Design a protein around this nucleic acid. Structure first.
Lengths: 174, 203, 126, 79, 108, 190, 141
RNA sequence: CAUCGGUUCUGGCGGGGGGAUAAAGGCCCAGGGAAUGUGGCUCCUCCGGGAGUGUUAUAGCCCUGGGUGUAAUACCCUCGC
RNA sequence: AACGCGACGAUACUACCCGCACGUUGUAGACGUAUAAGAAUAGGCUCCGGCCUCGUAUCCUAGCAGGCGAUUCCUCCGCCGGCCUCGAAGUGGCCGUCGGUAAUUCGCGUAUUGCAAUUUAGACACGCGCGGGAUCAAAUCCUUUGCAGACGACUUAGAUGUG
C-alpha cells in the first residue's frame, strides 16, 4: 500500500507512582510514514494491553532497513484478513529482495485476489525461507528450480504513444 | 507527431473503436484521413457477440414511418466504420460536419490508393492489443452475414491488385539489387576522404 | 542568411557583415533576439578594430537616412555612400582571406538556411 | 434460445432518479431497522472470539510452538 | 537554380480555447506544434511568437492578407500542447487551422 | 497460476515423415498424406530427440497446458492414419423391408457415394456423399455390412455418423421398430 | 523418421544473459526473480555501458545475443566483473549491430549546421558516382 | 529591444545536517556452513548428457566479526547561486 | 436518395475547345503540404552471404524567392510525339526530339526593406479578356390524345405523312 518502510516502534505507559519503570513494547510495523506507523502502533497496542495514546508515550521510532537488498530471497507471510464471514488465516510466499517489497506485493495481491483493503489486513509474521525446501507454494517452487531459463514469446514492442502512424507493421519476436 | 497532407490507413488488423477514436481525434485536429480495407477491420470478442449487437441495432426502427428519422442500418463495412467514427464527433455542429468531410472510407484499396503508402496505427492493431487466446472476428464477415452484397467483387479486385503489386515487387527487388551493385561499384571511385568524413558524420 | 558577428553593441544590437562578396549582406545592425549563433567561429585576425569601432559609431547608419529617402521619393537604385563601400571592402578583405582557409565555409556562408521535414529546432545543435 | 438472430428488448442500466432516491431511502431505513433488531435481538453472543489459529503450511510453526512453550515455562518460573 | 525551401518557422495547429467541459475562454488558445510531444520540448518554444495568417476580401494597404499576432505562454498538459495569447482572440472557425511559430525571440 | 514451461512428446516411426511449418502439420506415410492447420493453438514445435517431436507452451495457464494433450492426440491420430489407417464396419439390419445399399464412386467429384433405398418401405431414395479419401465397400465376408476405410479418422467417423443419422425412424416407437444402420466395429485397417 | 520442424527460436533469459537497457547501458542476469523481473549487474569499465547492480524489469530490457558462458547463479559484482573482462563482453557489444546503430544515432544527433551542410555536399558528391555507376549498370544489363 | 519592480510557473548547479554518523556494495583479514554441489572421482548411456559422492579444487555462494571508513549513494530537512 | 452514381445522343447563344493575360474572385486553411509489395506475429525478409526492437529510415535538400559569364559534367528534371498500357471512382512505362540543369572550381552583382513586422509566391474552381479553331440545338406555353387524370402530372399526335 504505497512505498512502505518498516519501523520499530517502541512505546510505553506513562510513568506513575505505582510504576516508575513501566514495560516497553516494541513492534515492527509497515507504514508509509512515521505518523501512520505510530497510529498503527497505538491501534495494535489498544488491541493487546491497557495502554492508549492519552495514557502512554512513544519512546522511539526507528527505520529498519533491509540487510541485503541486492540478494534474491523467498519470504513467507502469515496474515489474517477480515472478510464478510470473519477473520481468516492466509499463508503466502513472495520471491522479492526485501521485506518491504514483499509486503507491498502482499497488499497488491490481496487487493487483487480477495478485495481486502489496508484497514482489514493484519500482518502477523514475515519470515525468510533459509532453505529452498521450506518453499511450499508451487508458483515459487517453479521459480526456485535448477537451471531456470525461459523465453518471452509475443513481446509487444514499446512504441511511443505520441507517434500515431507507423509505416511498418511491428513484429513481436524481440 | 507530423502534419501530413493526407494519411492513408490500412484497415487490416485494426480494432474498430480504437481506430475510430484515433481517426476522429485526427479529424477534429484537422488532418485528412483515408481508411481503406474496412472489411478487414477487427472487433474483439468472438463473432456471435458482434452478430448479436448488430441484430439488436437492426431491431431499432421508428414506428410510424420507417422512411424518415429512423436509424438507417448500413450493411457495408466502410459505413459501419463511418458510424463508429461519427459517434465520436459532434456531427450536429458545423465543426463536426467539416471534420467528417475530411474522412473517406472504402472497401478494399480502390485506385489511386493502390499506388500510395498505407500506414498502420500501433495503438489499434489487434496483434499488439489483444492477449493471445482471446477471440476476435472481422467486420467483413459480419457485413456479409447481415446483408452486404459485394464480398466477392471486392475479393476478386483484391487478388487482381495483389497480383499487380507482386509484379511491382519483383521490379522493386530488381531496382534494389541494382542499387546495391551501383553502391558497391561507386565505393571504389568516391574519394576516401569523403567516405571517411561521411562515416565519421554518421552516414 | 548566414553572417559574421563583428561587435556586440548596446541594448541588444549587434554589428554584422556577410561578407558582402560572399552572400550579399553588407555591414549592418541586427537585434540579438532575431539571430541564432552557430557554433563555428571565423577568426578575426587581420580585421582592423579601429574601423570596426568607426562603423560601430551610433550615427554611422541612421545619418542622412531622410536625405536618401527624400532624394529617391523610372525607379533607380539608392546610391551606396563611398564611405560605406570603402569600409565594407576594408573590413571584409581580411575576413574573406580568413574564410577561404577553412574548407566549404565560403559556400556555407553563401547558402541560406531553411527548415526541412523532420527538422526539430528544439533538438538541433547550432 | 434464438437470442443471437432475434434479440429481445434490452435491459436498461440507466437508472432513474426516482429509483435511486427510493433505493437509498429503503437502504437507510433497513439499516436503522436492523440496528433496532440488533439491540432487541436475544440470541446469545460469546464475549471471547474463537481464534482461527496457526496455519499448517507455515514452515516455522514448530519453532513458534517451541518459542511459546519456552515463554510459558519462563513466565511460570518467574511467577 | 536553387531547389530548396524558404521556411524559417515551425508549423502548428489551432486546436481549441482554454476550456473546462462546458465553459470556454477565447482569451487563451491551445496550439499543437509539429514535432513537440512533451513539456520538455514545449519549454523551448515558451515565449516564441506565433502568427495566424488568413486571407480577407478587401485589399487594405496593398494586401488582402491579415495577420493576428500572439505568443506562447505556458505548456498545456503532458503531450506538448502549448497555451498561447494573441492580441485578439483567434476565430472559433479557425479550430484546426494552421499557425506559424517563429524562432524569435531567440535564446540560442 | 501461470506455468513457466510445459511439454509433451510424440514418437514418430521410421516410415513417417513429418513436416511442420507455421503450425501447419503435414504427415506422410506408406498409405498417404494428411494435412492439418493447428494455428488456433499457441504451441512451439521442436525436435527434442531423433524421431521425437516436442510440443511446448511457455507462460501458459492450465487451459493452455491442457490443450497440448489435444494437439498430441491429433498428431498421433494423423500418424496412425498414415501408417495403419482407420476402418469403421457398419451393419444395416431390417425387420420386414430389406434395405438396399448401392455404393458408387462419382468421378468428377472423385468421391464415394452411398445410395440407400427401401427403408421401412419408403419410396424416397437417400443419398450420402462421402468425404474425400473415404472408401466405402460392401463386405463379402459378412451379411449386410458396409466397410468405411481411410487415412483420416475424422472423415471416416463423420461419414459413418452421416450414414447412421440419415436412416432414422420418425414418429414411431423405437422399442418396437429397431431398423437402421449402426456402427458395429471401429478399428484399424492393418 | 524424417522430421522437418521450422519453428521460432527466441532468445532466453538465463544466468549470464546480457541485457541492454533503455539508457543504452548493459547488464548481465545473475539471478531470475520471476517472469517479469531479474537481478542484474553491469560491471563494465566504460561508464556509458555500466549499470549498477539491482532489479531490472524485463519490459525495459532487450535480449542481446551475448551470453557469458558458465556464470554461477547469484555471483557478486567481483565475480561478474571477472567474467565480463574474461569473456570480453564490451568488444562483442561493439561488434553487435545494435551498438553500431546507436553510434550512428549519436553521430547524427551530434551534428551542427555546418556539419549538416557538409554532409549534404559530400552526399551529393558520392551520389554523383553512385548515379553514374547505376546508369552504367542499367545500360550494360 | 535593454535595464527594473510586483506576482507566478518551470529547469539546472554548488554546499551543509540527520539515520544503524543510512543500509548496501567493492577491496583485504579471521572463522563457520550449505546446496538449485564447481573441479575431480565413480556408474550408466541415444555417449548429447544424466545419476551418486563431497565443502573449492581447474566456479562460486551464504552467515559472523574487524579494517579502509567520519567511504559513496538513496531518502528527508536545509543554506544559496 | 427529389443535395447518390454511371453510360449515351444532340448541343443555337457571348454559348464549346486551344494559348497566355490577369484577378480588392472563392476555398474547415500549401509552404519538401516527397515515400504502393503481400503476408505472419508461438515468426518473417533476402542480393542467398546473411538480416529483423527502432520511419531516430530513404529520397530530395547550396546559387538575386536563387542572376550573368566561364571551368566542367553526361547526372537529374520537364514539355511534346509514337508504341504499349491503365476500367474499383480509369495512367503510368519505354523510345525519340527539344529546353533547363555546380558532380568540381572561379569572377562580377547583392547594400538603402535603414534593428522584427505573412516570406502577398502553391493547387483547384470561377470570371473578365483578347488571339485562333470547331458547331448551327432543344424544351415549354398552345392544339390534340385517353393506355392517364381533382388540378398539376402522365401516355400520344401536331413540319408533306402509311399525316
Amino acid at each position: 500500500m504505497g512505498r512502505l518502510q518498516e519501523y520499530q516502534v517502541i512505546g510505553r505507559h506513562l510513568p506513575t507512582e505505582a510504576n516508575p519503570n513501566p514495560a516497553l513494547y516494541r513492534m515492527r510495523i509497515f507504514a508509509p510514514n512515521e505518523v501512520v506507523a505510530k497510529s498503527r502502533f497505538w491501534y495494535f497496542l489498544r488491541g493487546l494491553k491497557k495502554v492508549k495514546k492519552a495514557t502512554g508515550e512513544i519512546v522511539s521510532v526507528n527505520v529498519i532497513s533491509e540487510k541485503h537488498p541486492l540478494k534474491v530471497k523467498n519470504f513467507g507471510i502469515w496474515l489474517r484478513y477480515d472478510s464478510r464471514s470473519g477473520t481468516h488465516n492466509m499463508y503466502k510466499e513472495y520471491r522479492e529482495t526485501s521485506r518491504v517489497a514483499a509486503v507491498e506485493a502482499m497488499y497488491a495481491d490481496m487487493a487483487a485476489r480477495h478485495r481486502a483493503r489496508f484497514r482489514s489486513i493484519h500482518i502477523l509474521k514475515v519470515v525468510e525461507l533459509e532453505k529452498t525446501e521450506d518453499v511450499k507454494r508451487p508458483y515459487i517452487k517453479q521459480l526456485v528450480a535448477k537451471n531456470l531459463s525461459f523465453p518471452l514469446p509475443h513481446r509487444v514492442p514499446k512504441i511511443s504513444t505520441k507517434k500515431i502512424f507507423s509505416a511498418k507493421r511491428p513484429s513481436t519476436f524481440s | 507527431s507530423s502534419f501530413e497532407s493526407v494519411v492513408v490507413i490500412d484497415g487490416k488488423g485494426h480494432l474498430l473503436g480504437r481506430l475510430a477514436s484515433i481517426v476522429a481525434k485526427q479529424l477534429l485536429s484537422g488532418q485528412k484521413i483515408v481508411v481503406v480495407r474496412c472489411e478487414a477491420l477487427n472487433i474483439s470478442g468472438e463473432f456471435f457477440r458482434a452478430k448479436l449487437k448488430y441484430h439488436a441495432y437492426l431491431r431499432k426502427m421508428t414506428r410510424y414511418n420507417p422512411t424518415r428519422g429512423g436509424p438507417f442500418h448500413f450493411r457495408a463495412p466502410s459505413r459501419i466504420f463511418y458510424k463508429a467514427v461519427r459517434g465520436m464527433i459532434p456531427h450536429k455542429t458545423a465543426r463536426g460536419a467539416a471534420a467528417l468531410e475530411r474522412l473517406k472510407v472504402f472497401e478494399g484499396v480502390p485506385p489511386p490508393y493502390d499506388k500510395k503508402k498505407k500506414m498502420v496505427v500501433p495503438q489499434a492493431l489487434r496483434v499488439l492489443r489483444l492477449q493471445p487466446g482471446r477471440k476476435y472476428c472481422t467486420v467483413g464477415r459480419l457485413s456479409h452475414e447481415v446483408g452486404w452484397k459485394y464480398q466477392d467483387v471486392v475479393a476478386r479486385l483484391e487478388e487482381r491488385r495483389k497480383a499487380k503489386g507482386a509484379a511491382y515487387y519483383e521490379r522493386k527487388k530488381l531496382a534494389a539489387r541494382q542499387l546495391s551493385e551501383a553502391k558497391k561499384a561507386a565505393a571504389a571511385k568516391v574519394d576516401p576522404k569523403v567516405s571517411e568524413a561521411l562515416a565519421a558524420y554518421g552516414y | 542568411k548566414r553572417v559574421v558577428l563583428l561587435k556586440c553593441l548596446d541594448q541588444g544590437v549587434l554589428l554584422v557583415t556577410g561578407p558582402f562578396k560572399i552572400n550579399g549582406v553588407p555591414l549592418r545592425r541586427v537585434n540579438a533576439r532575431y539571430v541564432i549563433a552557430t557554433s563555428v567561429k571565423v577568426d578575426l585576425t587581420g580585421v582592423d578594430q579601429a574601423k570596426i569601432d568607426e562603423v560601430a559609431q551610433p550615427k554611422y547608419f541612421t545619418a542622412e537616412k531622410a536625405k536618401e529617402k527624400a532624394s529617391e521619393e523610372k525607379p533607380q537604385k539608392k546610391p551606396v555612400s563611398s564611405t560605406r563601400a570603402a569600409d565594407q571592402k576594408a573590413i571584409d578583405k581580411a575576413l574573406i582571406a580568413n574564410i577561404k582557409k577553412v574548407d566549404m565555409l565560403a559556400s556555407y556562408l553563401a547558402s541560406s538556411f531553411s527548415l526541412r521535414k523532420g527538422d526539430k529546432p528544439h533538438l538541433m545543435k547550432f | 434460445a434464438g437470442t443471437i438472430n432475434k434479440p429481445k428488448k434490452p435491459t436498461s442500466k440507466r437508472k432513474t432518479t426516482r429509483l435511486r432516491a427510493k433505493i437509498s431511502k429503503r437502504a437507510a431505513e433497513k439499516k436503522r431497522k436492523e440496528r433496532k433488531l440488533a439491540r432487541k435481538n436475544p440470541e446469545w453472543r460469546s464475549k471471547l472470539k474463537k481464534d482461527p489459529g496457526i496455519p499448517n503450511l507455515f514452515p516455522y510453526k514448530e519453532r513458534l510452538l517451541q518459542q511459546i512453550e519456552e515463554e510459558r515455562i519462563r513466565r511460570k518460573e518467574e511467577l | 537554380p536553387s531547389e530548396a525551401g524558404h521556411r524559417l518557422y515551425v508549423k502548428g495547429r489551432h486546436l481549441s480555447y482554454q476550456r473546462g467541459r462546458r465553459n470556454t475562454h477565447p482569451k487563451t488558445s491551445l496550439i499543437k506544434i509539429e514535432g513537440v510531444d512533451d513539456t520538455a520540448a514545449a519549454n523551448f518554444y515558451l515565449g516564441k511568437r506565433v502568427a495566424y495568417v488568413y486571407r480577407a476580401q478587401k485589399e487594405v494597404r496593398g494586401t488582402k492578407i491579415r495577420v493576428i499576432w500572439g505568443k506562447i505562454t505556458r505548456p498545456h498538459g503532458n503531450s506538448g500542447v502549448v497555451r498561447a495569447k494573441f492580441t485578439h482572440p483567434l476565430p472559433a472557425r479557425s479550430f484546426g487551422a494552421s499557425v506559424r511559430i517563429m524562432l524569435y525571440p531567440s535564446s540560442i | 497460476m501461470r506455468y513457466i514451461h510445459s511439454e509433451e512428446t510424440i514418437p514418430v516411426p521410421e516410415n513417417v515423415k513429418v513436416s511442420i511449418k507455421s503450425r501447419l502439420v503435414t504427415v506422410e506415410g506408406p498409405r498417404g498424406k494428411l494435412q492439418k492447420d493447428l494455428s488456433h493453438i499457441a504451441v512451439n514445435f521442436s525436435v527434442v530427440k531423433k524421431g521425437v517431436i516436442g510440443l511446448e507452451i511457455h507462460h501458459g495457464s492450465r487451459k493452455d497446458v491442457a490443450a497440448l494433450r489435444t494437439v498430441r492426440t491429433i498428431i498421433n491420430n494423423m500418424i496412425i492414419g498414415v501408417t495403419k489407417g482407420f476402418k469403421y464396419k457398419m451393419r444395416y439390419v431390417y425387420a420386414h423391408f430389406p434395405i438396399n445399399v448401392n455404393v458408387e464412386k462419382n468421378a468428377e467429384t472423385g468421391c464415394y457415394e452411398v445410395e440407400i433405398r427401401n427403408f421401412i418401405g419408403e419410396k424416397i431414395v437417400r443419398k450420402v456423399v462421402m468425404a474425400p479419401g473415404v472408401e466405402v465397400e460392401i463386405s463379402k465376408a459378412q451379411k449386410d455390412e458396409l466397410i468405411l476405410s481411410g487415412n483420416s479418422l475424422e472423415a471416416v467417423s463423420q461419414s459413418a455418423a452421416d450414414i447412421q443419422q440419415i436412416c432414422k425412424v420418425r414418429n414411431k416407437d423405437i422399442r418396437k421398430f429397431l431398423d437402421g444402420i449402426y456402427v458395429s466395429e471401429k478399428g484399424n485397417i492393418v | 523418421a524424417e522430421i522437418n520442424v521450422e519453428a521460432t527460436s527466441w532468445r532466453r533469459v538465463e544466468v549470464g544473459r546480457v541485457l541492454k537497457l533503455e539508457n543504452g547501458s548493459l547488464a548481465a542476469i545473475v539471478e531470475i526473480i520471476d517472469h517479469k523481473r531479474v537481478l542484474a549487474d553491469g560491471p563494465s569499465s566504460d561508464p556509458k555501458l555500466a549499470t549498477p547492480r539491482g532489479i531490472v524489469p524485463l519490459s525495459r530490457a532487450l535480449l542481446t545475443p551475448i551470453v557469458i558462458p558458465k556464470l554461477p547463479r547469484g555471483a557478486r559484482t567481483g565475480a561478474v566483473k571477472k567474467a565480463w573482462e574474461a569473456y570480453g563482453v564490451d568488444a562483442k557489444w561493439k561488434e553487435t549491430n545494435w551498438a553500431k546503430k546507436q553510434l550512428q544515432q549519436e553521430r547524427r544527433q551530434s551534428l551542427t549546421d555546418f556539419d549538416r551542410f557538409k554532409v549534404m555536399r559530400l552526399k551529393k558528391q558520392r551520389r554523383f558516382e553512385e548515379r553514374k555507376a547505376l546508369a552504367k549498370i542499367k545500360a550494360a544489363a
